[PDB]
Every structure is written in structure tokens, then in C-alpha cells.
Design goal:
2 copies of one chain form a homodimer.
Chain A lengths: L8 E4 L7 H7 L4 E6 L7 H12 L7 E4 L1 E3 L2 E2 L11 H11 L1 H20 L5 E2 L23 H17 L5 E5 L20 H6 L3 H8 L4 E4 L3 E2 L3 E4 L4 H11 L5 E6 L4 H11 L3 E3 L4 H8 L10 H7 L6 H9 L1 H14 L2
EC number (chain A): 3.2.1.52
Keywords (chain A): Cell cycle, Cell division, Cell shape, Cell wall biogenesis/degradation, Cytoplasm, Glycosidase, Hydrolase, Peptidoglycan synthesis
Family (chain A): Belongs to the glycosyl hydrolase 3 family. NagZ subfamily.
């Protein structure tokens, strides 16, 4: 089994099992991980086979991720506990108070991560830390709450739950996607607010999560003209000056999906301060990108990938899932997802 | 005097709070028939009335002005307007208090939504969403009335009656149904793998019913349905001519999917394929440069139905008549009721 460092590109796969073409593509040194989607899921046993064959190609093993946020963002349904939307936890905060909501968030995190860990997944791209300003449909009910304190505290509780399931957290979408409108038209409108306004609200959950060991951040494809004319994901000011130096974040900075040529788009992401670029739904663009690709010099990259590897072994996870307390967490979380 | 020019097949937009001279010249072009407004075009009620008046004064028939006021997280104009609830609130009323209470509530939401916009010189809101809440699509999310096509159809019809009291027609979206796909990445073209039979049993039914009952316009989904066509709905003859025009019998406006192709990241070709697929009117937003490129030497495609399709959407209520209705106790009670749903 070839020993190749994990490269700075996260790619994806077409269907339920790897094809030979996909195997050769995943051997490229540009690639360090894979993101899975609903089209990659048939059942639990197929999924375990898929993640095993991805893992068997090379060492260090390719990091595997998925979007399991809850509600209308949960790729794998059949055989998993149905997860509630994150705004349901914010509704519990308003109705039954902070303590009940935090406890609920902890259980959602635990269930979410553990069930994925059992299938060979390393990481879910969660939580959303965007604030519910009542402006952005594409975020919508994926946001915990309007109030930065509720978001911060619900996210921290979810994070602790994720860690019990073996996973780190990935906060999104830095520095805050909640204020802009985002619905039926495909252009990214500006967020015209000042840095002071963002520090008072949208940035606070990111600061707090960073301090408490958040492993990864994904930037917003949003321009904040009072801070920089570039979108956050392509901005040295946002990613190096604000996120790295001022906030002190030491983890992975993912790019969002750069499909939206690709070589230049990836270059500007890396120059801005992203560690890893995501290229989804477009194996052609991954092939274009990797051909003659120069891996940017990033001495921190290997450790940043390895921090995201799942912390639970296969047997350890099978043991936790037989416990009465985990089975009770499952039933509790399932109940939050139904009326 | 004020020039008499037919409304063209392009809907464009504007940069800020008042027209610039360049925008005025652009809006005189015979390629243009209407304007879509966004939050960036809104400062206050009085500025908005001035903006719509100056747009209207350029030519006759007056340019059609539209906006996205759905409710909840899709409401462009906030300050001085009643805050509108998300459409799923009406579906929650359906589940809890029954169809009659929900329909009555939908009628009031429609009335408030349309009347307040009509007062500002707006012709049309791009509402309602007829997408079904399959529990799959975040970008639709709470903008859908309900999971069940019957509830969606009936809530939409009641909203439509409300809209008409405020002077407006309706625009159903996103044909043939955006509810089943996942949609949490802004720029991605989702794939809905279902058969036409599956869509006829559910997602298409609200569109059929709204069409029969006088829906004025449809906006297509930026979604590929591979079992029916390899092209997205807004670029598909099968979806727009075969299914929507001939099978369903829809006679209103088909707006375009405003999509810049991998070629352009030009516009003349993109507009051409939209018209060839069956769109009446193409939207070009946030890119006055592409509107300028498009209109220069533009040949207006021959569409004998276009003039009447635009005119059906013109607001039915006069400016003074609306200012009078808004002072009535029954309208002010509608406002407070709708505001309460949004809390």
C-alpha cells in the first residue's frame, strides 16, 4: 500500500463503489480527502465497504467527510437516526431554557458523530455558526438562533457531543453568512456592515469555538466590502489577518466548493490562507487541477489533516452503540426530529 | 411627450435608490419590458414611490416592476412594511387548526403582502412557492407551505385570492418542483432523479391547479430531471412546451432561469436558448453590462402573446385607491394579524 502524504485537495466520487478511474484519481498526491453525498449512499453495509476501499488505497488514509448538519442537510437517511434541524435546538433554548437546549445539543452531536464513525467517516462539516438574522434562505433553519450567545453555547455543546462520537468540529461559514440574502438568484450579494458590527455579533461564535478547540473552519462565499473587496475565502485579510493572527485559530481552513479556470481559483484560495480546497461534483475539474499541480508549501498541512482523523476505533464504537445510554440518546434525538 | 414602445422580452434591474441617466437610457431600449427590485434599491417608502414613479414615467405601456416578497427570509423591503411570516407558518396552521383557519390566514397574508407593495408602485411579487416540503431542500426550507400537495395547492389558491385583493397576480415557483432535491450549496445545479409519473402524482399538482385558477406567471427550477430531459427545466422544450404549455395548458408568462453558462462565467446565446426552450421573458440581474451587450443589435423574437402576458401582470389598483384602503380598520386589522404570525 503506497505511502503518500495527504495532499491539499478534497475531491468526491460518483456512486456507491469506487471505479478503477476513481481509484487512480484518489492515488494522486494532490488529493488528501473525500467528501461524500447522498448519491454515494445505498445502505449501511455498502457505505462501510465504500469507506474501507477508500481507506485501503494509501497511507496516511484519505480523510472522509460528509455534510450531516441535521434537518434538510443530512445525506444518509436509511439506517441512521433522523437528526433535527439546528434551529430546533434554538427553539428548545427559547422555550425550556439554555440548560435543556445545551443538553439536547450534546446528545444530537453524540448521535450524529457516533453513527457516522461506525461507517468509517472521519468528520461532519458541522456546526453552522451563522446567525439567524431572518435574511438568508440558503442558511435558513440550519442556523441555531439569532442570538450570538445562544449560537456559541449550542455549538460548544454540540462540539462536545461530536467529540464523544470521535469527531472534531468544522465551523461555518466564516466570518458569518447569516446577514446576506441568499435565495433564488445565483449572485452573492455583499454584506455591507462594518467590522465592529461583525465583532459584536457574527464573529463571536467563531472566536469562542476557536478558543475551545474547533478543528476546522469553512469560509463564506460572501464579500464584506468595508473589510475587503474579495470574498472571505479568497481574502488574506479575513483568513490570515483576522482568523489566524487576531483570533489565533490554528486548525484547518477549508475552501468552500470551488466549482461555482480551476487552477487559478485554487491558487488564490491557497494564497489567501486555505489549507485545503474542495472540488465537488466535477471529477473533470479535479483531473484538470491535479495535472501538473504544484503542492503549495504548507508545513502545517500534515498535522492539520491528522487532527481531523476519527478518534474512535471500530471496536470502541461498536461497544458504545450497545450501551443503554447511547440507545436512549438515539431515541431522544429521533424524537426531536419528529412531531 | 412620453414614447410609446412595446414591452420587450427582457427584465433587467437597477443599481441603487434612484435611476441614473445611464439606467434611464437603458430602460428606454425596446428589448426591455420590466424591472426587478432588490433590497439594495430600498431606503424608505417615500424613496421607493419616487423610484417606481420615475421608472413608470419613461415609457408606455409602463415597465412592469416586480420584487421577491414571499415572507420570512425572503422579503426585500422591511422598514415601513408589515413583516411577513414564512409560508410554512400557514402550513402549521393547517396541521393545528385545520384547513379553514389556514386558508383564511393565507388570504390575509396575501392581501397585506400585495397591498403594501401596490401602494409603492410595484406590480407583482414573485410568490407563491409551490415546491413541496419533502424534508430535503434547505434553500427552500420554510418557504414551502407543506409536504402535502393538497395543502400546498389550497394554501396557494387562498394566498392568490388575497394577492388579487391587493391588486396583484401570482407567480408560481419553481416549476416543475424544487422540493425533492438537496440544496445547501448556493451555486450548485441539483439533480432530481425521479420519473415524470412520480412528479405528476405530487410536485406538479399545485402547478396544474394554480394554472387552471389563473396563475399569471411561472418561474422554472434551476434543476435537471434526467428521466425527462438532460437540460435544466428553464432550458428544456420538453418541460416548458410539451409539459407546461400543451399538457397543463398554461397560458401565462414563463420567466427564465437567470443562469450565466460556463462559457461566459455570451449572453446573446444564453438568451436565445431560453427563448427557444419556451421562456417569454428573460431575467438578467446584477449585470447591467450583460444587459447592454444583449440589447445592442437585439432582435426581439416574434411572440404575439407577449404584450397580453405582460399586461395581465399590471397592478389592478390605482395609487390613491390603495392609500385609502390602507387607512381602513379592516386593512389595519389584517396588518396586525399578519405581523402577529411573523412574531
Amino acid at each position: 500500500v503506497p505511502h503518500i502524504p495527504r495532499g491539499p485537495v478534497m475531491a468526491d466520487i460518483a456512486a456507491f463503489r469506487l471505479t478503477e478511474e476513481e481509484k487512480q484519481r484518489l492515488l494522486d498526491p494532490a488529493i488528501g480527502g473525500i467528501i461524500l453525498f447522498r448519491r454515494n449512499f445505498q445502505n449501511i453495509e455498502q457505505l462501510k465497504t465504500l469507506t474501507a476501499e477508500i481507506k485501503a488505497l494509501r497511507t496516511p488514509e484519505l480523510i472522509i467527510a460528509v455534510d450531516h448538519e441535521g434537518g434538510r442537510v443530512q445525506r444518509f437517511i436509511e439506517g441512521f437516526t433522523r437528526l433535527p434541524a439546528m434551529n430546533v435546538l434554538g427553539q428548545i433554548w427559547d422555550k425550556d431554557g439554555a440548560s435543556a437546549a445545551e443538553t439536547a445539543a450534546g446528545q444530537v452531536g453524540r448521535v450524529l458523530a457516533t453513527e457516522l464513525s461506525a461507517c468509517g467517516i472521519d468528520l461532519s462539516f458541522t456546526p453552522v455558526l451563522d446567525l439567524d438574522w431572518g435574511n438568508c434562505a440558503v442558511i435558513g433553519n440550519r442556523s441555531f438562533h439569532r442570538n450570538p450567545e445562544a449560537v456559541a453555547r449550542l455549538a460548544l455543546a454540540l462540539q462536545k457531543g461530536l467529540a464523544k462520537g470521535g469527531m472534531k468540529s468544522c465551523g461555518k461559514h466564516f466570518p458569518g453568512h447569516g446577514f446576506v440574502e441568499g435565495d433564488s438568484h445565483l449572485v452573492l450579494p455583499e454584506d455591507g456592515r462594518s467590522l465592529d458590527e461583525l465583532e459584536a455579533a457574527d464573529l463571536a461564535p467563531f472566536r469562542i469555538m476557536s478558543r475551545e478547540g474547533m478543528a476546522a473552519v469553512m469560509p463564506a462565499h460572501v464579500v464584506y466590502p468595508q473589510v475587503d473587496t474579495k470574498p472571505a475565502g479568497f481574502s488574506e485579510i479575513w483568513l490570515k489577518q483576522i482568523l489566524r493572527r487576531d483570533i489565533g485559530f490554528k486548525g484547518v481552513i477549508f475552501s468552500d466548493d470551488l466549482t461555482m479556470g480551476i487552477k487559478e481559483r485554487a491558487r488564490i484560495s491557497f494564497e489567501a490562507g486555505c489549507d485545503i480546497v474542495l472540488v465537488c461534483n466535477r471529477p473533470d475539474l479535479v483531473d484538470e487541477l491535479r495535472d501538473g499541480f504544484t503542492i503549495p508549501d504548507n508545513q502545517d498541512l500534515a498535522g492539520r489533516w491528522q487532527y481531523m482523523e476519527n478518534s474512535l476505533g471500530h471496536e470502541a464504537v461498536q461497544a458504545v452503540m450497545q450501551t443503554m445510554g447511547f440507545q436512549a440518546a438515539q431515541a431522544f434525538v429521533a424524537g426531536l426530529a419528529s412531531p
